[PDB]
Amino acid sequence: SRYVNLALKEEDLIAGGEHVLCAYIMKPKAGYGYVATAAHFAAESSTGTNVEVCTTDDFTRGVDALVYEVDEARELTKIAYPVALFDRNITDGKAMIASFLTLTMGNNQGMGDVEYAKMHDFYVPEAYRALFDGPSVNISALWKVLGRPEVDGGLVVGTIIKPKLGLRPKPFAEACHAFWLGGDFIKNNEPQGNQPFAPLRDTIALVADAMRRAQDETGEAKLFSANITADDPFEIIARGEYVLETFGENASHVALLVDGYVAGAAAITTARRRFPDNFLHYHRAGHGAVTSPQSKRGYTAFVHCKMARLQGASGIHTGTSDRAIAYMLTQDEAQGPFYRQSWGGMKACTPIISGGMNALRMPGFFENLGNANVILTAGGGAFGHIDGPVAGARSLRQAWQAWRDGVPVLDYAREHKELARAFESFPGDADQIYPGWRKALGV
Amino acid sequence: SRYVNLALKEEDLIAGGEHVLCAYIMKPKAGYGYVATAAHFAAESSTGTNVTRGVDALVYEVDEARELTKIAYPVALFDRNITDGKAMIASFLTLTMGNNQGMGDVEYAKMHDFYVPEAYRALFDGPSVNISALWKVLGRPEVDGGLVVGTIIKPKLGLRPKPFAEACHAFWLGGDFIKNNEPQGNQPFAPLRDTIALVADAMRRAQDETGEAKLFSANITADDPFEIIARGEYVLETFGENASHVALLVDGYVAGAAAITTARRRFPDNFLHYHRAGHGAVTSPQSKRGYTAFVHCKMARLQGASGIHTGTSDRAIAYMLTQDEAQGPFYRQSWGGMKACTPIISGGMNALRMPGFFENLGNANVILTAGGGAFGHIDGPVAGARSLRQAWQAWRDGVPVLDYAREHKELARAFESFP
């Protein structure tokens, strides 16, 4: 009713790359011809023309995204987008994500001849990929600040403390100094900012000052991740401006955490464009919604993060088509579910894992990943510690560190306390993974 | 335990106003408890604690059979403007359809209703300008000067600068708002500069072919709020004195909140048109998860979108978004003098079945940007929107359609036009 192209080779478009390739999981309502569903599905990704037509009755086709290949009973639909249908900036000339989603998960995700359609992968030529922002920093910049080679600097360990909201300016400050003590990265957690109890500038003013203190105490260079997430661009520069004013002396140490799935793209381009060489930290928030695996209309989690290496993000949560992510964001040259991609300059976006990541299974994380340059936010290997927080991530550093160098964790953990207590913290984790740990460690 | 206070009564959370009440359709992974898990979701919506509590967001109801969980959260949970001090959407979205949106323990949980109490909704932004700030330019009473008809130009892209223009004035000449669709902008075929210089022109030509004012929503949407800013200055500048006849559009769901809010506090004198779209990834009834579409366009005017896309409770949505002491699936809302953000009304409404909408909605005071209500008419989409103009006209004038088929030729021909 217009649209499609199946004679066309995926790897042609790949080459004279004046076109975006999208790959989806879509099943039609049931009683409609697959190609009809997908020649359609691309009508609302392109020109529409919505019937047949020609605009000024000139060839408003060569704008037109045509399904380049489909596998009916594999629930698959690959569509090739000409680059021209993509919006750029006027005072700028750059690509913007805001057009790439409106184009591919906009009206798209509403059609009635579709049941679900899930994006599984994408391809961004040269042409187009390079009209985009890219991570301004990475972990590199954190390596700069902690005094680690900005090439295989490695893991930043944190903690999270509890609770997410509640402690006050000072009950807060201090919790954070105390963990500044057995790790290096502390986040204000997603919700955290200007609640009445505990205010932005009362509380940013004292974390500020608890880093003078920890970083002065220990004599290591502690990093913070302060949330400058707002509705208005002006309150995201202003939240963040005072942050780096108040931090004065130490704003190389300050990161900029934004709740970016729940904020949006202009909130992430404010932090990234108005605060270019500061790390802007994305907090995928109310995003299960879509990316989570048994919701079938998302952008899949892998598709989420690829999307954010393109747009300025320096960091993003997880790892642990979801072990590919970790490659899709760091390596410029790597295979996603269907399409290999070139980053041909663009700078990683960092994997910033979490959770029950422990000390006995850390080393396996770092082998099946291969790079140990992730940011590890702990509640797990941390509060799980039988010697609490403080020593919970100071057993974490150990675990990673054992690893670059080459020492078998049961005996690295044989030279220091933090890691020999990990083993007596986790069951048999220590029984699963670590052969008779009871004998060769202590007991 | 510290997250369930079932038996701690809704009417009273709801007469206190420092408790933001959320209703959701939650369902546990197999084996897993109900209330237990029901209170688990509150803890990762609010206070964790994990290993000063007057702060934990609490469950006060369950339905298990009807499979819902009710969560009631304190108001000193929500982040704010260090600046202005006004309430914000970002971290609201962060707690209610925040982290619980990616749980383990839960199969899915879609928000179905929410209640923003006055000691928190007052704090919010709310619309600056609505549909009466269209009225005043169309020159109608700016108190129910009702139906604003408009259009949708196709194709959606592949259109050159002279082309849009040509087609906006020839659709302006005919009937009043044109909308720049979701992908139109600074694209290389039709670059916003060389094209908005030309819409300006459209309009000024049109209004001297009409003696009536034209309205153009321009997709001032970008993902750097200065671009956003830049296009507005540029378009209200270029429109010279005709710059009141401009609606700013933010293709809205896919650009954020941060997008929504710059365009409303950079140009709060012009119409922030919330283009929804993408909504449906989360917002479809197939999606067991996210927020629902009732929630998305009311969250929308608290943040004050001037008008959103609402095209049919789906006038559950047209109440709770228009009015003042509205209701909705589970909670009854008070906007307390906070402004009416109008339903932009979509699709196939035809010249013939609209006063049945108008009657069935209790009002005509919304916007239409029709397809074939108009496209399928005889004198053209031309007469095709003069038909709807006039659909309205008759309607509200409290005189019936059929009788005005005759006094007025283009609607006559509408019935006539089409089965």
mmCIF file of C-alpha atoms in Angstrom, chain A residues 67-370:
data_model
loop_
_atom_site.group_PDB
_atom_site.id
_atom_site.type_symbol
_atom_site.label_atom_id
_atom_site.label_comp_id
_atom_site.label_asym_id
_atom_site.label_seq_id
_atom_site.Cartn_x
_atom_site.Cartn_y
_atom_site.Cartn_z
ATOM 1 C CA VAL A 67 11.804 -3.981 4.421
ATOM 2 C CA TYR A 68 15.019 -5.473 3.101
ATOM 3 C CA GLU A 69 14.392 -9.113 4.343
ATOM 4 C CA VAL A 70 11.859 -10.911 6.599
ATOM 5 C CA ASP A 71 11.446 -14.505 8.112
ATOM 6 C CA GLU A 72 7.787 -14.958 8.469
ATOM 7 C CA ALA A 73 7.899 -17.873 10.951
ATOM 8 C CA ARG A 74 11.014 -16.644 12.858
ATOM 9 C CA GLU A 75 8.972 -13.592 13.602
ATOM 10 C CA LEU A 76 11.553 -11.347 11.785
ATOM 11 C CA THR A 77 11.533 -8.054 9.913
ATOM 12 C CA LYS A 78 14.732 -6.125 8.704
ATOM 13 C CA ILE A 79 14.137 -2.522 7.439
ATOM 14 C CA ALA A 80 16.676 -0.221 5.725
ATOM 15 C CA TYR A 81 16.174 3.586 6.386
ATOM 16 C CA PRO A 82 17.685 6.143 3.735
ATOM 17 C CA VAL A 83 19.744 8.605 5.713
ATOM 18 C CA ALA A 84 17.921 11.700 4.513
ATOM 19 C CA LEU A 85 14.673 10.782 6.639
ATOM 20 C CA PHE A 86 16.756 11.627 9.729
ATOM 21 C CA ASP A 87 16.658 15.108 11.331
ATOM 22 C CA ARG A 88 19.876 17.077 12.021
ATOM 23 C CA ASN A 89 20.420 20.417 13.989
ATOM 24 C CA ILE A 90 20.350 24.076 12.606
ATOM 25 C CA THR A 91 22.697 25.868 14.992
ATOM 26 C CA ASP A 92 24.859 22.655 14.989
ATOM 27 C CA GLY A 93 24.237 20.235 12.085
ATOM 28 C CA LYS A 94 24.344 17.091 14.149
ATOM 29 C CA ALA A 95 22.259 13.977 14.359
ATOM 30 C CA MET A 96 19.815 13.722 17.266
ATOM 31 C CA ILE A 97 18.363 10.392 18.838
ATOM 32 C CA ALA A 98 15.032 12.124 19.280
ATOM 33 C CA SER A 99 14.561 11.600 15.517
ATOM 34 C CA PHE A 100 15.947 8.038 15.362
ATOM 35 C CA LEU A 101 13.278 6.848 17.935
ATOM 36 C CA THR A 102 10.465 8.806 16.549
ATOM 37 C CA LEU A 103 11.221 7.242 13.237
ATOM 38 C CA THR A 104 11.712 3.661 14.516
ATOM 39 C CA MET A 105 9.665 3.140 17.818
ATOM 40 C CA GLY A 106 7.200 5.956 17.471
ATOM 41 C CA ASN A 107 4.020 5.622 15.506
ATOM 42 C CA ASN A 108 5.608 2.142 14.787
ATOM 43 C CA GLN A 109 4.672 0.812 18.274
ATOM 44 C CA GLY A 110 1.017 1.588 17.826
ATOM 45 C CA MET A 111 -0.200 -0.037 14.611
ATOM 46 C CA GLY A 112 -3.152 -2.438 14.883
ATOM 47 C CA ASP A 113 -1.949 -4.927 12.248
ATOM 48 C CA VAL A 114 1.001 -5.545 14.432
ATOM 49 C CA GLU A 115 0.755 -7.271 17.888
ATOM 50 C CA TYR A 116 4.136 -6.492 19.139
ATOM 51 C CA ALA A 117 7.252 -5.514 17.196
ATOM 52 C CA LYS A 118 10.481 -5.504 19.166
ATOM 53 C CA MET A 119 13.703 -3.936 17.852
ATOM 54 C CA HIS A 120 16.448 -6.472 18.194
ATOM 55 C CA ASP A 121 19.433 -4.701 16.578
ATOM 56 C CA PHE A 122 20.493 -1.632 14.432
ATOM 57 C CA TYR A 123 23.073 -0.319 12.052
ATOM 58 C CA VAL A 124 24.222 3.412 11.781
ATOM 59 C CA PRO A 125 26.422 3.981 8.683
ATOM 60 C CA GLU A 126 29.408 6.482 8.882
ATOM 61 C CA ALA A 127 27.445 8.965 7.028
ATOM 62 C CA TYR A 128 25.111 9.296 9.949
ATOM 63 C CA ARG A 129 26.699 7.861 13.138
ATOM 64 C CA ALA A 130 29.283 10.625 13.228
ATOM 65 C CA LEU A 131 26.665 13.439 13.255
ATOM 66 C CA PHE A 132 26.213 12.207 16.863
ATOM 67 C CA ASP A 133 27.725 13.335 20.134
ATOM 68 C CA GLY A 134 29.557 10.224 21.494
ATOM 69 C CA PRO A 135 30.719 9.676 25.001
ATOM 70 C CA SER A 136 32.674 12.919 25.911
ATOM 71 C CA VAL A 137 34.404 11.022 28.682
ATOM 72 C CA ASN A 138 34.361 7.341 29.832
ATOM 73 C CA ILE A 139 35.962 5.663 32.804
ATOM 74 C CA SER A 140 39.244 6.982 31.136
ATOM 75 C CA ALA A 141 38.532 10.317 32.862
ATOM 76 C CA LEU A 142 37.986 8.503 36.192
ATOM 77 C CA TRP A 143 41.264 6.657 35.478
ATOM 78 C CA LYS A 144 42.716 10.196 34.966
ATOM 79 C CA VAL A 145 41.390 11.250 38.388
ATOM 80 C CA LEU A 146 42.279 8.042 40.509
ATOM 81 C CA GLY A 147 45.711 8.007 39.009
ATOM 82 C CA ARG A 148 45.375 4.870 36.669
ATOM 83 C CA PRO A 149 46.674 4.671 33.134
ATOM 84 C CA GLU A 150 43.869 5.850 30.907
ATOM 85 C CA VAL A 151 44.242 2.449 29.102
ATOM 86 C CA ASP A 152 43.257 -0.652 31.267
ATOM 87 C CA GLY A 153 42.967 1.434 34.359
ATOM 88 C CA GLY A 154 40.239 -1.041 35.342
ATOM 89 C CA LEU A 155 37.440 -1.334 37.883
ATOM 90 C CA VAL A 156 35.987 1.566 39.937
ATOM 91 C CA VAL A 157 34.358 0.054 43.110
ATOM 92 C CA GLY A 158 31.648 1.692 44.947
ATOM 93 C CA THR A 159 28.818 1.090 47.154
ATOM 94 C CA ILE A 160 25.374 2.146 47.547
ATOM 95 C CA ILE A 161 23.991 2.906 50.832
ATOM 96 C CA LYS A 162 20.946 2.646 52.396
ATOM 97 C CA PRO A 163 18.546 3.702 52.163
ATOM 98 C CA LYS A 164 17.903 5.217 48.753
ATOM 99 C CA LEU A 165 15.985 8.122 50.306
ATOM 100 C CA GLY A 166 15.845 9.028 53.993
ATOM 101 C CA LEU A 167 19.100 9.852 55.764
ATOM 102 C CA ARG A 168 19.666 13.620 55.950
ATOM 103 C CA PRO A 169 22.300 16.131 54.816
ATOM 104 C CA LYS A 170 24.783 15.000 57.451
ATOM 105 C CA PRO A 171 23.485 11.446 58.335
ATOM 106 C CA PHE A 172 24.047 11.252 54.472
ATOM 107 C CA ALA A 173 27.328 13.114 54.081
ATOM 108 C CA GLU A 174 29.074 10.712 56.557
ATOM 109 C CA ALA A 175 27.633 7.401 55.425
ATOM 110 C CA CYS A 176 29.358 8.300 52.138
ATOM 111 C CA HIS A 177 32.664 9.284 53.690
ATOM 112 C CA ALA A 178 32.703 5.946 55.516
ATOM 113 C CA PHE A 179 32.299 3.980 52.308
ATOM 114 C CA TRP A 180 34.692 6.571 50.736
ATOM 115 C CA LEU A 181 36.939 4.717 53.125
ATOM 116 C CA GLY A 182 36.539 1.041 51.592
ATOM 117 C CA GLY A 183 36.034 1.889 47.910
ATOM 118 C CA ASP A 184 36.031 4.935 45.531
ATOM 119 C CA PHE A 185 32.794 5.756 43.827
ATOM 120 C CA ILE A 186 29.721 6.607 45.803
ATOM 121 C CA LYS A 187 26.197 7.293 43.908
ATOM 122 C CA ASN A 188 23.359 9.470 45.231
ATOM 123 C CA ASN A 189 20.815 6.711 44.253
ATOM 124 C CA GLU A 190 18.295 7.428 41.520
ATOM 125 C CA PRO A 191 15.583 9.330 43.452
ATOM 126 C CA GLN A 192 17.970 11.474 45.582
ATOM 127 C CA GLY A 193 18.239 15.311 45.261
ATOM 128 C CA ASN A 194 16.032 18.039 46.627
ATOM 129 C CA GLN A 195 13.593 16.326 49.020
ATOM 130 C CA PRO A 196 12.804 18.684 51.900
ATOM 131 C CA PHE A 197 14.561 16.704 54.540
ATOM 132 C CA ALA A 198 17.820 16.526 52.798
ATOM 133 C CA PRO A 199 18.458 19.396 50.310
ATOM 134 C CA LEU A 200 20.610 19.623 47.185
ATOM 135 C CA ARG A 201 22.882 22.422 48.398
ATOM 136 C CA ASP A 202 22.977 21.488 52.066
ATOM 137 C CA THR A 203 23.757 17.937 51.231
ATOM 138 C CA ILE A 204 25.853 18.557 48.095
ATOM 139 C CA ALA A 205 27.802 21.119 50.199
ATOM 140 C CA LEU A 206 28.665 18.364 52.806
ATOM 141 C CA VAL A 207 29.399 15.333 50.522
ATOM 142 C CA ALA A 208 31.567 17.906 48.872
ATOM 143 C CA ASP A 209 33.247 18.325 52.232
ATOM 144 C CA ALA A 210 33.312 14.532 53.164
ATOM 145 C CA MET A 211 35.455 13.911 50.087
ATOM 146 C CA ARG A 212 37.919 16.656 51.156
ATOM 147 C CA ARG A 213 37.940 14.421 54.361
ATOM 148 C CA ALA A 214 38.194 10.726 52.894
ATOM 149 C CA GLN A 215 40.489 11.767 50.072
ATOM 150 C CA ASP A 216 42.579 13.640 52.706
ATOM 151 C CA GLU A 217 42.224 10.789 55.337
ATOM 152 C CA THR A 218 43.232 7.881 53.053
ATOM 153 C CA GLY A 219 44.950 10.073 50.404
ATOM 154 C CA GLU A 220 43.404 8.604 47.312
ATOM 155 C CA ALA A 221 41.113 10.545 45.013
ATOM 156 C CA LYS A 222 37.437 9.762 45.676
ATOM 157 C CA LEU A 223 34.802 10.218 42.922
ATOM 158 C CA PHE A 224 31.169 11.210 43.281
ATOM 159 C CA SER A 225 27.986 10.736 41.281
ATOM 160 C CA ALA A 226 25.480 13.455 42.119
ATOM 161 C CA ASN A 227 22.091 13.473 40.364
ATOM 162 C CA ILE A 228 21.351 16.746 38.457
ATOM 163 C CA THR A 229 18.192 15.260 37.005
ATOM 164 C CA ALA A 230 15.395 17.736 36.511
ATOM 165 C CA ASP A 231 12.440 18.476 34.307
ATOM 166 C CA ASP A 232 13.976 21.832 32.988
ATOM 167 C CA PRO A 233 17.304 22.158 31.154
ATOM 168 C CA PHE A 234 17.934 25.187 33.378
ATOM 169 C CA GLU A 235 17.547 23.163 36.611
ATOM 170 C CA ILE A 236 19.860 20.419 35.294
ATOM 171 C CA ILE A 237 22.698 23.052 34.526
ATOM 172 C CA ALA A 238 21.833 24.908 37.828
ATOM 173 C CA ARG A 239 21.637 21.633 39.909
ATOM 174 C CA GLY A 240 24.958 20.724 38.293
ATOM 175 C CA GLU A 241 26.592 24.210 38.262
ATOM 176 C CA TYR A 242 26.349 24.652 42.032
ATOM 177 C CA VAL A 243 27.591 20.919 42.286
ATOM 178 C CA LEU A 244 30.788 21.875 40.411
ATOM 179 C CA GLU A 245 30.924 25.322 42.257
ATOM 180 C CA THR A 246 30.744 23.927 45.767
ATOM 181 C CA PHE A 247 33.059 21.167 44.668
ATOM 182 C CA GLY A 248 35.436 23.908 43.342
ATOM 183 C CA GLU A 249 38.896 22.475 44.016
ATOM 184 C CA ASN A 250 37.564 18.865 43.282
ATOM 185 C CA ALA A 251 35.137 18.830 40.343
ATOM 186 C CA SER A 252 37.164 16.396 38.238
ATOM 187 C CA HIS A 253 35.904 13.921 40.842
ATOM 188 C CA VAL A 254 32.294 14.750 40.217
ATOM 189 C CA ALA A 255 30.087 12.770 37.990
ATOM 190 C CA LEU A 256 26.743 13.563 36.711
ATOM 191 C CA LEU A 257 24.117 10.796 37.291
ATOM 192 C CA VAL A 258 20.951 11.353 35.416
ATOM 193 C CA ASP A 259 17.888 9.089 35.439
ATOM 194 C CA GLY A 260 17.829 9.173 31.718
ATOM 195 C CA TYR A 261 15.167 6.660 30.678
ATOM 196 C CA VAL A 262 12.702 8.462 33.013
ATOM 197 C CA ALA A 263 14.198 11.990 32.180
ATOM 198 C CA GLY A 264 14.738 11.709 28.453
ATOM 199 C CA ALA A 265 17.179 12.634 25.706
ATOM 200 C CA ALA A 266 17.260 16.575 26.188
ATOM 201 C CA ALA A 267 18.153 15.958 29.861
ATOM 202 C CA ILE A 268 21.028 13.796 28.786
ATOM 203 C CA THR A 269 22.146 16.251 26.033
ATOM 204 C CA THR A 270 22.100 19.135 28.642
ATOM 205 C CA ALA A 271 24.521 17.398 30.992
ATOM 206 C CA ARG A 272 26.562 16.158 28.083
ATOM 207 C CA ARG A 273 26.527 19.498 25.995
ATOM 208 C CA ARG A 274 26.490 21.999 28.969
ATOM 209 C CA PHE A 275 29.017 19.887 30.889
ATOM 210 C CA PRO A 276 31.200 18.256 28.254
ATOM 211 C CA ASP A 277 34.221 16.930 30.122
ATOM 212 C CA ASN A 278 32.545 15.657 33.291
ATOM 213 C CA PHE A 279 31.238 11.975 33.312
ATOM 214 C CA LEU A 280 27.564 11.699 32.566
ATOM 215 C CA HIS A 281 26.344 8.529 34.009
ATOM 216 C CA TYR A 282 23.065 7.230 32.728
ATOM 217 C CA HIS A 283 20.673 5.564 35.090
ATOM 218 C CA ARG A 284 18.427 3.287 33.009
ATOM 219 C CA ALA A 285 15.438 3.610 35.348
ATOM 220 C CA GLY A 286 11.812 2.743 34.676
ATOM 221 C CA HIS A 287 12.923 0.836 31.577
ATOM 222 C CA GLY A 288 12.062 -2.845 32.444
ATOM 223 C CA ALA A 289 8.743 -1.676 31.068
ATOM 224 C CA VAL A 290 10.184 -2.124 27.512
ATOM 225 C CA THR A 291 13.613 -3.746 27.390
ATOM 226 C CA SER A 292 12.769 -6.427 29.991
ATOM 227 C CA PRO A 293 12.463 -9.808 28.130
ATOM 228 C CA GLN A 294 8.792 -10.733 28.266
ATOM 229 C CA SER A 295 7.379 -7.415 27.189
ATOM 230 C CA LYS A 296 7.413 -7.700 23.484
ATOM 231 C CA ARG A 297 7.159 -4.101 22.186
ATOM 232 C CA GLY A 298 10.386 -2.589 23.545
ATOM 233 C CA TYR A 299 13.754 -1.725 22.001
ATOM 234 C CA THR A 300 15.579 -4.634 23.657
ATOM 235 C CA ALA A 301 18.109 -3.801 26.466
ATOM 236 C CA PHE A 302 20.920 -4.421 24.099
ATOM 237 C CA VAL A 303 19.316 -1.749 21.748
ATOM 238 C CA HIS A 304 19.051 0.650 24.652
ATOM 239 C CA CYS A 305 22.693 1.061 25.429
ATOM 240 C CA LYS A 306 24.027 1.202 21.835
ATOM 241 C CA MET A 307 21.691 4.034 21.505
ATOM 242 C CA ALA A 308 23.467 5.831 24.409
ATOM 243 C CA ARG A 309 27.034 5.438 23.305
ATOM 244 C CA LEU A 310 25.845 7.387 20.293
ATOM 245 C CA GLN A 311 24.337 10.264 22.389
ATOM 246 C CA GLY A 312 27.000 11.333 24.856
ATOM 247 C CA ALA A 313 26.727 8.701 27.647
ATOM 248 C CA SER A 314 29.935 7.805 29.330
ATOM 249 C CA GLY A 315 28.419 5.129 31.616
ATOM 250 C CA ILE A 316 25.343 2.994 32.010
ATOM 251 C CA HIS A 317 24.373 -0.037 34.378
ATOM 252 C CA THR A 318 24.850 -3.668 33.853
ATOM 253 C CA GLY A 319 26.217 -6.544 32.330
ATOM 254 C CA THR A 320 26.384 -9.830 33.864
ATOM 255 C CA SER A 321 21.845 -10.521 23.428
ATOM 256 C CA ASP A 322 22.813 -9.163 26.722
ATOM 257 C CA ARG A 323 26.539 -10.156 27.025
ATOM 258 C CA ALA A 324 27.144 -8.551 23.683
ATOM 259 C CA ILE A 325 26.120 -5.114 25.243
ATOM 260 C CA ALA A 326 29.490 -4.962 26.923
ATOM 261 C CA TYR A 327 31.151 -4.975 23.486
ATOM 262 C CA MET A 328 28.653 -2.985 21.733
ATOM 263 C CA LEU A 329 29.495 -0.092 24.141
ATOM 264 C CA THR A 330 33.250 -0.399 24.377
ATOM 265 C CA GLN A 331 34.809 -1.911 21.351
ATOM 266 C CA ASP A 332 34.484 0.287 18.232
ATOM 267 C CA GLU A 333 33.951 -2.712 15.956
ATOM 268 C CA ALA A 334 31.469 -5.258 17.262
ATOM 269 C CA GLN A 335 28.589 -7.610 16.473
ATOM 270 C CA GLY A 336 25.179 -7.176 17.965
ATOM 271 C CA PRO A 337 22.348 -9.724 17.338
ATOM 272 C CA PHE A 338 22.172 -9.208 13.554
ATOM 273 C CA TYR A 339 24.537 -6.321 12.657
ATOM 274 C CA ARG A 340 28.173 -5.795 13.172
ATOM 275 C CA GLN A 341 28.887 -2.049 13.751
ATOM 276 C CA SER A 342 31.877 0.260 13.314
ATOM 277 C CA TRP A 343 32.426 3.144 15.799
ATOM 278 C CA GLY A 344 35.436 4.320 13.827
ATOM 279 C CA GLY A 345 36.337 7.004 16.334
ATOM 280 C CA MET A 346 33.557 6.887 18.887
ATOM 281 C CA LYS A 347 34.804 6.332 22.327
ATOM 282 C CA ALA A 348 33.329 3.703 24.645
ATOM 283 C CA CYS A 349 30.384 4.099 26.958
ATOM 284 C CA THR A 350 31.118 2.128 30.102
ATOM 285 C CA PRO A 351 29.554 -1.017 31.571
ATOM 286 C CA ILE A 352 28.730 -0.034 35.219
ATOM 287 C CA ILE A 353 27.524 -3.357 36.687
ATOM 288 C CA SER A 354 25.917 -3.946 40.095
ATOM 289 C CA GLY A 355 24.481 -6.306 42.630
ATOM 290 C CA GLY A 356 25.360 -9.596 44.203
ATOM 291 C CA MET A 357 28.652 -9.362 42.376
ATOM 292 C CA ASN A 358 30.826 -10.946 44.834
ATOM 293 C CA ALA A 359 34.370 -11.471 45.543
ATOM 294 C CA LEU A 360 34.500 -15.314 44.788
ATOM 295 C CA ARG A 361 32.779 -15.104 41.532
ATOM 296 C CA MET A 362 34.334 -11.613 40.580
ATOM 297 C CA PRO A 363 37.305 -13.220 38.822
ATOM 298 C CA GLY A 364 35.051 -15.292 36.600
ATOM 299 C CA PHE A 365 33.164 -12.136 35.672
ATOM 300 C CA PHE A 366 36.439 -10.638 34.600
ATOM 301 C CA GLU A 367 37.401 -13.753 32.531
ATOM 302 C CA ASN A 368 34.127 -14.318 30.668
ATOM 303 C CA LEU A 369 34.174 -10.391 30.026
ATOM 304 C CA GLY A 370 37.885 -10.118 29.292
#
